[PDB]
Amino acid sequence: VDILNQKTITSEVAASVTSKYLQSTFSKGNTSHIEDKRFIHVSSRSHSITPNEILSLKFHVSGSSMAYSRMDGSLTVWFIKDASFDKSVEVYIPDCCGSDKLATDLSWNPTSLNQIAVVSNSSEISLLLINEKSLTASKLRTLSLGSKTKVNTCLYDPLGNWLLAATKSEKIYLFDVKKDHSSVCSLNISDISQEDNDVVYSLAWSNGGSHIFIGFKSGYLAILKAKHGILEVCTKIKAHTGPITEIKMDPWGRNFITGSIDGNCYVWNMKSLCCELIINDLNSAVTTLDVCHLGKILGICTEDEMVYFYDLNSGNLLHSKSLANYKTDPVLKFYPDKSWYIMSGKNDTLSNHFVKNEKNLITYWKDMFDNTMIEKRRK
Amino acid sequence: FFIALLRKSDSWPSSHVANNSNYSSLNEGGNMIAANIISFNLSQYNEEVDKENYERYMDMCCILLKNGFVNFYSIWDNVK
Amino acid sequence: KEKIPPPAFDETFKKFTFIKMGNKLINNVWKIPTGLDKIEQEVKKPEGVY
Amino acid sequence: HKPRLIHKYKTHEPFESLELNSSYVFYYSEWNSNLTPFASVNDLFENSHIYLSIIGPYLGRIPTLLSKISRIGVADIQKNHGSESLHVTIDKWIDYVRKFIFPATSLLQNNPIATSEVYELMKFFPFEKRYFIYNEMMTKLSQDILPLKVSFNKAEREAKSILKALSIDTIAKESRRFAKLISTNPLASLVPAVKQIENYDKVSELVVYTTKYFNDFAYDVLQFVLLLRLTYNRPAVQFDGVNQAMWVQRLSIFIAGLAKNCPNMDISNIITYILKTLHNGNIIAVSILKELIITVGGIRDLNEVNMKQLLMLNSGSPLKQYARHLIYDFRDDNSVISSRLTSFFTDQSAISEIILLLYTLNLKANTQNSHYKILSTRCDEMNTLLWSFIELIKHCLKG
């Protein structure tokens, strides 16, 4: 009765549907293990242990490619056109960004259909193409600048219009993308944070692509413009009492979420730039953090090795799984076009992904409605 | 439509229209026959039908208080 | 039939005290005269003591 | 690239929302036609005697409204900095923040972010008028309003339940539980915490470990509570006078443990407590300074040294540095900690005032007559304290 009373999605019938979607995605027929190279190596040593955690996992904005970089060695790039995850590895590159250092961060290109930008830890950003016919990965260029000490992070603009590479001690670089990959500006981190010797932990682009959010070690949060080439500081608020771990954005452009090393996770709205909702998560330090693409599920994963699932409008809990016997740093990641997710860690350092037959939550409620309606058209 | 219909009928207080936006005139009112039906009908909430139509009826009576159709203290004194 | 008068709102703020701190105990510690002239008249001369 | 498609519905709920594809709005759009949004600062001060006095201590149920008024205050002091109308602008914001902003902060449950926005307005105040507001809200708690009194009795009941099950194995996650209760309202929750420090041992090492998750508001209240327990009326010296007390030693290990571990903490009002109280001649001010030199500095005494070790200390050498490594005289290890402490004594301009005070207090002990053997020890104890204070001056003030 309570299904067919409301014919549009209300606040209450949405929170009861999304608690059945997360309940039915943990099942037996709705989970499959990714046939990786480490899933081959672990399954031999377990039938008959060296840890290499993953360092990044990124999705293409079309939602059709997935790349990720293990600790010791290689990049791995999967290609999914529609077949769930059993379609094709295209490439994996054992010496990807050189043969001396590691691959720390990754970013895809939103404009070009097939191009990554892998950043080492030395001083150099190597842009490389992933070939579609053959299984190879050829380079395109290699960027560098003067007074460049050690780059850690790289981010593309969500419009594909800039590139932001940052050190955690010295400086922050902008590279224009449209004309040529040329340095436009450079800002010293001591001008951003005036207090002490801070270490930049996380960064994010806004949904428009004109502001940058920077999270320090002392708990400060700086918001700084990028108009055409100028890079100046707009505000500076003190958010947490600890290092700001991760920063996310709402996909509807309403609010943004920050996490820290105390058990603390706020939801700040983007108009008035004040805190709006507080999640009471007094368990441990939040490690990873992500939202859905409809903007309703929020996945928190702390250092108690337990994952939670909240709402963004309210702050209520939907589901909770405990994964305690593993030795992972487990990574949640939601798909960008459909409402599936890929939770890392099955045995040692692995990746499973949790599927259904319906893509969204909206085409799940629309199928639950039409199955109930047949019964009321039966009586 | 509902407001512009009541302002042309002969049940609108033409000279007793006095407003609730002042501080001395929450007793000077208009149309005490409609104040006798509104406060009688906001007092009945015991059946299972008028527990569901209560939010729509109460929202309509607050548009009639903005405009000056009913006095404020004639509803506040005589409702349960 | 009761003539409602206009209400009177208080636009005045509360005034402070003569104790410049919270307690009378914490305030008493901050009234001791400190300086280099106070030690001067106490230790005055050792040969006068000797 | 295609945009997202939504569709409006008009509902009866006042607050705007957005579901998976549907957004909801209030049906009566002319709800704000009689109201007028007011002008800059002179109209806010008139219209707040009407609206904000109806919900007195209930503004803390809307924490986003308490954060908005506090940013009007910081942005008004800074733009009207000038040099002429600044002592007038601060005084106008003293009486506003104490009539109906600080009572609203006490009815808060878990908001360390709503309390940091209020304190950034109180950083512009003198510390005398900031200590007036703290004491009065522990006096008009009980004699005045009821909803504030139910809130203070809920924080004290919760702080007294954490401190009982406080063990050295549970502080992995009870450090984060305890530090949000302090960060929200410290005046209710810190006072049962320092009252359980001077009662039992082994709880100084647990509370100082929790202090890495405090905010800047709970660092300024903790200095007020420690100044409250030291001037509190109690027998400082024990009955006959052979010993001091049991609380006066447990509280000086706590103070000397905040100046070593926590670096975002100003203790420059404990130091000027020591200056004015040594002029009187005191036994609480001495036993704090004795633990500040032995713990923060690493200076140890030459009372149990061997004859082979004594010649190594005088040879100006790295043989000198190895001899301190054997008698646990860690000076060069913590040079960053000990140089921060010495700067507190220079801003008071009181390094040559401590030396002349510790000297005549050693000679004033040849005038008092209370006991016999303890006055032979107190003459020797004010000799090790003066010797070990000079050794901290020579190590830091070079040039």
Short mmCIF file of all heavy atoms in Angstrom, two decimals, chain A residues 239-258:
data_model
loop_
_atom_site.label_atom_id
_atom_site.label_comp_id
_atom_site.label_asym_id
_atom_site.label_seq_id
_atom_site.Cartn_x
_atom_site.Cartn_y
_atom_site.Cartn_z
N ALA A 239 38.88 24.47 9.53
CA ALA A 239 37.79 23.51 9.55
C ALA A 239 37.94 22.50 10.68
O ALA A 239 37.09 22.43 11.57
CB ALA A 239 37.70 22.80 8.21
N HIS A 240 39.01 21.72 10.66
CA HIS A 240 39.17 20.61 11.58
C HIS A 240 40.36 20.85 12.51
O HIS A 240 41.16 21.76 12.32
CB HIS A 240 39.36 19.30 10.82
CG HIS A 240 38.24 18.96 9.89
ND1 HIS A 240 37.22 18.11 10.23
CD2 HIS A 240 38.00 19.34 8.61
CE1 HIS A 240 36.39 17.98 9.21
NE2 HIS A 240 36.84 18.73 8.22
N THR A 241 40.45 20.02 13.54
CA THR A 241 41.63 19.90 14.40
C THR A 241 42.47 18.70 14.00
O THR A 241 42.62 17.74 14.76
CB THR A 241 41.21 19.80 15.85
OG1 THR A 241 40.56 18.54 16.06
CG2 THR A 241 40.23 20.89 16.19
N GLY A 242 43.02 18.72 12.79
CA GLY A 242 43.78 17.60 12.29
C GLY A 242 43.95 17.73 10.79
O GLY A 242 43.38 18.63 10.17
N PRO A 243 44.73 16.84 10.18
CA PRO A 243 44.91 16.89 8.72
C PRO A 243 43.61 16.58 7.98
O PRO A 243 42.94 15.58 8.26
CB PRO A 243 45.97 15.81 8.46
CG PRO A 243 46.02 15.00 9.70
CD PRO A 243 45.73 15.96 10.80
N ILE A 244 43.26 17.45 7.04
CA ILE A 244 42.09 17.22 6.20
C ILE A 244 42.42 16.13 5.19
O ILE A 244 43.26 16.32 4.31
CB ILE A 244 41.66 18.51 5.50
CG1 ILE A 244 41.19 19.54 6.52
CG2 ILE A 244 40.54 18.23 4.54
CD1 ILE A 244 40.78 20.84 5.90
N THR A 245 41.76 14.98 5.33
CA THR A 245 42.14 13.81 4.55
C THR A 245 41.62 13.89 3.11
O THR A 245 42.40 13.81 2.16
CB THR A 245 41.64 12.54 5.25
OG1 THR A 245 42.45 12.30 6.41
CG2 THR A 245 41.75 11.35 4.34
N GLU A 246 40.30 14.03 2.93
CA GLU A 246 39.71 13.99 1.60
C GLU A 246 38.62 15.05 1.48
O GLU A 246 37.95 15.39 2.45
CB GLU A 246 39.16 12.59 1.29
CG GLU A 246 38.86 12.35 -0.18
CD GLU A 246 38.88 10.90 -0.56
OE1 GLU A 246 39.27 10.07 0.28
OE2 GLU A 246 38.49 10.58 -1.70
N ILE A 247 38.46 15.57 0.26
CA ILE A 247 37.46 16.57 -0.09
C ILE A 247 36.67 16.06 -1.29
O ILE A 247 37.26 15.64 -2.29
CB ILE A 247 38.12 17.93 -0.41
CG1 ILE A 247 38.98 18.42 0.75
CG2 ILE A 247 37.08 18.97 -0.74
CD1 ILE A 247 39.80 19.61 0.42
N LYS A 248 35.34 16.10 -1.21
CA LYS A 248 34.47 15.70 -2.31
C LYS A 248 33.51 16.83 -2.64
O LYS A 248 33.46 17.85 -1.97
CB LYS A 248 33.70 14.43 -1.98
CG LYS A 248 34.52 13.18 -2.14
CD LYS A 248 34.84 12.97 -3.60
CE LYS A 248 35.74 11.77 -3.79
NZ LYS A 248 36.24 11.66 -5.19
N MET A 249 32.73 16.63 -3.71
CA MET A 249 31.75 17.61 -4.16
C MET A 249 30.41 16.92 -4.41
O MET A 249 30.36 15.74 -4.77
CB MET A 249 32.18 18.31 -5.45
CG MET A 249 33.54 18.95 -5.40
SD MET A 249 33.46 20.64 -4.82
CE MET A 249 34.90 20.64 -3.77
N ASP A 250 29.34 17.67 -4.22
CA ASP A 250 28.02 17.16 -4.58
C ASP A 250 27.89 17.15 -6.09
O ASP A 250 28.37 18.07 -6.76
CB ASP A 250 26.93 18.05 -3.99
CG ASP A 250 25.63 17.32 -3.78
OD1 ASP A 250 25.65 16.09 -3.61
OD2 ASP A 250 24.57 17.98 -3.79
N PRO A 251 27.27 16.14 -6.70
CA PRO A 251 27.09 16.19 -8.15
C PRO A 251 25.98 17.12 -8.60
O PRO A 251 25.80 17.31 -9.80
CB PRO A 251 26.76 14.73 -8.50
CG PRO A 251 27.35 13.96 -7.40
CD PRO A 251 27.09 14.78 -6.19
N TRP A 252 25.19 17.66 -7.67
CA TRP A 252 24.19 18.66 -8.04
C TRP A 252 24.68 20.07 -7.74
O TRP A 252 23.97 21.05 -8.00
CB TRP A 252 22.87 18.38 -7.32
CG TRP A 252 22.24 17.11 -7.74
CD1 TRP A 252 22.46 15.90 -7.21
CD2 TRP A 252 21.29 16.92 -8.79
NE1 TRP A 252 21.71 14.95 -7.85
CE2 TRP A 252 20.98 15.56 -8.83
CE3 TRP A 252 20.66 17.78 -9.69
CZ2 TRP A 252 20.08 15.03 -9.74
CZ3 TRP A 252 19.78 17.25 -10.59
CH2 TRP A 252 19.49 15.89 -10.61
N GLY A 253 25.87 20.18 -7.17
CA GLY A 253 26.48 21.47 -6.94
C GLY A 253 25.92 22.22 -5.75
O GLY A 253 25.97 23.45 -5.70
N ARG A 254 25.37 21.48 -4.78
CA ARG A 254 24.81 22.11 -3.59
C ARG A 254 25.84 22.28 -2.49
O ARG A 254 26.06 23.39 -2.01
CB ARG A 254 23.63 21.28 -3.07
CG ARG A 254 22.37 21.39 -3.90
CD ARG A 254 21.41 20.25 -3.60
NE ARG A 254 22.02 18.94 -3.77
CZ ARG A 254 21.47 17.80 -3.35
NH1 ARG A 254 20.30 17.83 -2.73
NH2 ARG A 254 22.09 16.65 -3.53
N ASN A 255 26.51 21.20 -2.10
CA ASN A 255 27.38 21.22 -0.94
C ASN A 255 28.69 20.52 -1.27
O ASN A 255 28.90 20.05 -2.38
CB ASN A 255 26.70 20.58 0.27
CG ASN A 255 25.89 19.37 -0.09
OD1 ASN A 255 26.40 18.42 -0.68
ND2 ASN A 255 24.62 19.38 0.27
N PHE A 256 29.60 20.50 -0.29
CA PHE A 256 30.82 19.72 -0.38
C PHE A 256 31.18 19.15 0.99
O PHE A 256 30.77 19.67 2.03
CB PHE A 256 31.98 20.53 -0.98
CG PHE A 256 32.51 21.63 -0.10
CD1 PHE A 256 33.65 21.44 0.65
CD2 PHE A 256 31.92 22.87 -0.11
CE1 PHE A 256 34.15 22.45 1.43
CE2 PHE A 256 32.43 23.89 0.66
CZ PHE A 256 33.54 23.68 1.44
N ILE A 257 31.93 18.06 0.98
CA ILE A 257 32.14 17.22 2.16
C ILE A 257 33.64 17.17 2.46
O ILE A 257 34.45 17.03 1.54
CB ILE A 257 31.58 15.80 1.93
CG1 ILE A 257 30.08 15.83 1.61
CG2 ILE A 257 31.74 14.94 3.15
CD1 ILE A 257 29.74 15.72 0.14
N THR A 258 34.01 17.29 3.74
CA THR A 258 35.40 17.18 4.16
C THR A 258 35.52 16.12 5.24
O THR A 258 34.59 15.94 6.04
CB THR A 258 35.95 18.51 4.67
OG1 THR A 258 35.06 19.05 5.64
CG2 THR A 258 36.11 19.49 3.54
#
